[PDB]
């Protein structure tokens, strides 16, 4: 049930998240685009400084009034094929170099931590206050800087499949925001798109998003969702922790199979007033796919001895998840102290650097960084025993991969439905059926993906916002409106891209999308979308 205090907590968390996102965008522009800075910041340094900025801003608000506050999703920066989970610690740089020596150059940006021109850099971060969560994620593009022009600008737009993915993600974000705002004024929904007396459904959400992805020649990556957020239950760890009640729309390999053929999420819900919704969309480019295939995910481990593949990424995840249903008294004192701090954190994913007493640093000093690393080594000693007894788990690093359908059809699985990975640590993905109609399990699909020579990786673009449906009473101006807690035209401003595709106007769904864009651009007699503003810094 919404209230003024709940709305204020959401607004404060959203403002903190917007300010942090603006900070990291400015840092990237200064390091790579403005090029005024002497030293180029790398990915782990960006993540660490972002988390410190979030904590220092959050210290000033809701002191001695709220039991729990902090970082909801640790600052993640993902590059091209890497679809999420990339928040490396600062003490893993030499490890990454040593592990990936003798590999390809395909993951060079993530291995080195230095960005390169043409990279799709996805920034994701979230803030929770009293369990009320706001999350934001934006894709930006790294361009080469022009020299002849007086003013620092890119030499050209981003072109190709990466541009297609960025455009698909951005347009899907805008259309979904408009559609969910139409739930407050159902009479404003375009007639062709849906009924005047009909509400907003997950079916309509899915078909609009699929129409846009199909128009831009992209797939929807299986981690995408448009779900409802409640207190302490935001899907901060959706692939790891289970939930009793779920209201939203997801995309999976099973949904891809059903589309090609034509606690459990389902698109049989009506978007109601007075609720908070998270919209997270990942679009994978299908530029290099000359056939029809399936979009899946490959998990990253830290073992270089598991194969001889040159284009494999070896890395260790930086974010851990505490399982409060598991109890075990540890044998190491360092382990017991670390567990005490981890239980102090909460039900959100955490970094080991977040647990240091020095962090966040008041003054960015070489000795402060050194003291943080000194704490980090002992933290790793404790963490090994904590994870060896299943008290914490790793939130995975995932890469979007493409598997053609002919290989899946020709492949033979003697076990069918019955096969499942019994060595998997997590129960939720271990007991998974990506293809219920074909009887192909997760371990079988991973085997097929690894056996294929035409199983390539796909660049991914990401857009993720949080919105609240404010009623006539809750809103200021006595009319219902959509309050966007994060994202919009101030922070998630699109990069310079150009695509060869566009929505073909001879489609009813496309016409409905265009009518929604018209009603959004109208501010008098249309939709009311109020964007949350970042606070000032200097």
């Amino acid at each position: 049930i919404l209230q003024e205090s709940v709305l204020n907590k959401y607004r404060t968390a959203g403002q903190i998240a917007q300010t942090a996102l603006k900070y990291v965008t400015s840092l990237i522009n200064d390091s790579y685009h403005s090029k005024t800075t002497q030293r180029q910041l790398t990915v782990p340094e960006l993540c660490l400084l972002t988390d410190s900025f979030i904590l220092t801003r959050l210290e000033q608000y809701y002191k001695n009034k709220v039991n729990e506050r902090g970082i909801a999703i640790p600052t993640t920066i993902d590059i091209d094929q890497i679809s999420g989970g990339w928040c490396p610690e600062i003490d893993d740089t030499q490890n990454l170099l040593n592990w990936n020596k003798g590999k390809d150059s395909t993951f060079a940006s993530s291995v080195t931590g230095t960005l390169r021109p043409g990279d799709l850099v996805k920034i994701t971060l979230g803030v929770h206050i009293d369990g009320y969560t706001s999350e934001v994620s934006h894709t930006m593009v790294i361009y080469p800087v022009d020299e002849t022009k007086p003013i620092l600008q890119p030499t050209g737009p981003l072109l190709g499949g990466k541009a297609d993915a960025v455009a698909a993600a951005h347009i899907a974000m805008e259309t979904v925001v408009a559609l969910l705002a139409c739930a407050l004024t159902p009479e404003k929904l375009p007639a062709s798109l849906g009924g005047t007396s009909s509400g907003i459904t997950g079916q309509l959400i899915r078909t609009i998003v699929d129409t846009i992805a199909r128009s831009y020649n992209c797939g929807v990556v299986p981690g995408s969702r448009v779900r409802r957020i409640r207190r302490f239950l935001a899907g901060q760890n959706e692939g790891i922790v289970a939930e009793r009640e779920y209201k939203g729309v997801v995309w999976t390999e099973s949904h891809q199979e059903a589309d090609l053929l034509s606690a459990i999420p389902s698109d049989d819900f009506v978007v109601q007033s007075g609720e908070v919704y998270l919209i997270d969309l990942k679009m994978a480019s299908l530029e290099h796919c000359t056939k029809k295939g399936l979009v899946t995910l490959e998990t990253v481990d830290s073992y270089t001895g598991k194969s001889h593949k040159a284009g494999e990424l070896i890395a260790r995840p930086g974010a851990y998840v505490r399982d409060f249903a598991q109890t075990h008294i540890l044998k190491l004192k360092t382990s017991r102290q670390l567990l005490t701090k981890i239980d102090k954190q909460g039900v959100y994913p955490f970094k080991l650097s977040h647990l240091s007493s020095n962090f966040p640093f008041v003054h960015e000093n070489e000795e402060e960084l050194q003291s943080l690393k000194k704490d980090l080594k002992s933290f790793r000693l404790g963490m090994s025993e904590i994870s060896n007894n299943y008290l914490c788990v790793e939130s995975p690093i995932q890469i979007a991969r493409w598997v053609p359908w002919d290989h899946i059809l020709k492949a033979t699985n003697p076990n069918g439905n019955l096969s499942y990975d019994a060595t998997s640590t997590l129960t939720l993905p271990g007991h998974e059926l990506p293809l219920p109609k074909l009887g192909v399990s997760a371990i079988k699909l991973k085997s097929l993906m690894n056996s294929t020579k035409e199983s390539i990786s796909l660049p991914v673009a990401r857009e993720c916002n949080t919105i609240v449906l404010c009623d006539s009473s809750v809103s200021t101006t006595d009319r219902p409106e959509l309050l966007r807690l994060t994202g919009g035209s101030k922070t998630c401003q699109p990069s310079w891209i150009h695509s060869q595709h566009e929505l073909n106007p001879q489609d009813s769904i496309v016409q409905g999308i265009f009518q929604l864009a018209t009603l959004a651009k109208d501010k008098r007699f249309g939709l009311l979308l109020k964007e949350t503003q970042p606070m000032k810094q200097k």
Binding site: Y143, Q153, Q493
Partner: peptide, 26 residues
């Protein structure tokens, strides 16, 4: 056979542009 029919159905099935942003750094 439902598996046979699903496999044959899948076999039968598989058998200006736009601009965003501009020359400036957001």
């Amino acid at each position: 056979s439902s598996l046979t029919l699903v496999k044959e159905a899948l076999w039968s099935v598989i058998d200006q542009g736009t601009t965003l942003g501009g020359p400036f750094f957001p």
